Amino acid sequence: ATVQQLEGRWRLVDSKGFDEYMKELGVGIALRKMGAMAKPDCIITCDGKNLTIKTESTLKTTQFSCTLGEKFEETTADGRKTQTVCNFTDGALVQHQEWDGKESTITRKLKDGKLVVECVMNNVTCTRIYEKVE
Numbered sequence: 001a002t003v004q005q006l007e008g009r010w011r012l013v014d015s016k017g018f019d020e021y022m023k024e025l026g027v028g029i030a031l032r033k034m035g036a037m038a039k040p041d042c043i044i045t046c047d048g049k050n051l052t053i054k055t056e057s058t059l060k061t062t063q064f065s066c067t068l069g070e071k072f073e074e075t076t077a078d079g080r081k082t083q084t085v086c087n088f089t090d091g092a093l094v095q096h097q098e099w100d101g102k103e104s105t106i107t108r109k110l111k112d113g114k115l116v117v118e119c120v121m122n123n124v125t126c127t128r129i130y131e132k133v134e
């Protein structure tokens with residue numbers, strides 16, 4: 001498994017636990033409803049150690065870029081400003097966020113040709129499955 005194999009445009013086909021993960025983050029109702037109903041595409045690009053992830057939908061689009069292994073300020077969809085680090089480790093892209101004494105991890109991995117995105121904060125989890133599209 002390599003970080004490059006995650007590259008491309010992917011479209012959301014299934015979600016579980018997302019609303020509860022947003023509740024654990026303390027996301028307010030406006031943003032939770034938009035999350036309930038955006039069916040985004042996730043676009044992953046990686047050039048050596050440079051990574052960009054763009055999550056795109058008519059409701060909401062976010063994008064960040066980083067260097068793998070280097071701490072950076074991420075503005076999240078819900079407007080947190082986190083200190084994030086992304087690494088490709090044990091065959092998954094692991095995005096670790098720390099802010100105001102709190103932490104959350106988002107992992108992205110290939111499983112059976114699908115992109116599986118898993119979020120966790122304080123044992124509250126979400127799992128989102130994306131299929132590779134043109």
Ligand SMILES: CN1CC[C@H](C(=O)O)[C@@H](c2ccccc2)c2cc(Br)ccc21
Pocket residue numbers: 022027031035038040042055056057060061062076077078106117119128
């Ligand atoms: C870190 N991600 C992972 C989960 C979601 C995804 O990429 O499918 C993502 C998101 C972004 C734009 C539109 C809908 C959902 C999201 C939304 C939010 Br409100 C908080 C974190 C978060």
